[PDB]
Amino acid sequence: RTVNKHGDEIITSTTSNYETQTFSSKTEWRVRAISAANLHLRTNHIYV
RNA sequence: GUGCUCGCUUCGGCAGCACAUAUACUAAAAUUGGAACGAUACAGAGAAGAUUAGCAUGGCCCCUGCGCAAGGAUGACA
Numbered sequence: 001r002t003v004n005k006h007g008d009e010i011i012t013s014t015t016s017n018y019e020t021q022t023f024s025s026k027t028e029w030r031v032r033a034i035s036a037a038n039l040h041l042r043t044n045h046i047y048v
Numbered sequence: 049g050u051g052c053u054c055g056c057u058u059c060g061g062c063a064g065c066a067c068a069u070a071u072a073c074u075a076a077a078a079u080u081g082g083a084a085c086g087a088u089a090c091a092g093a094g095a096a097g098a099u100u101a102g103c104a105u106g107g108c109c110c111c112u113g114c115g116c117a118a119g120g121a122u123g124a125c126a
Contacts, residue, residue, distance in 0.1 A: 004087060004088070005087075005088095006087085008087090010087090010088080012088070012089080013089080014089070014090090015089080015090075016089090016090070016091085
């Protein structure tokens with residue numbers, strides 16, 4: 001959802017890969033699930 | 049149409065007479081076609097040589113070896 005040169009609030013479909021870098025840090029379902037993997041191996045040192 | 053004829057003829061009318069003499073792309077309407085360098089989309093270094101590494105050839109000067117041609121000076125008793 002962009003604006004044109006005159007600011008007309010249009011919707012465009014672009015293909016130039018220049019603002020496409022995904023962030024995906026510390027708050028994603030995929031990243032969170034990958035962190036949850038091997039969580040069973042983290043239950044050894046039970047600090048009571 | 050206006051006005052007039054000593055006309056027919058009546059004021060209800062008629063016949064003739066003078067003037068009027070040739071506008072308009074004419075158009076209100078009919079329809080189906082072909083259409084940007086305007087936007088968004090892409091690209092965007094939108095002005096450079098379009099290169100530098102060796103060796104061999106070619107020119108000049110020596111040195112050495114071999115060949116060809118023509119030569120110079122010298123050496124050897126029993």
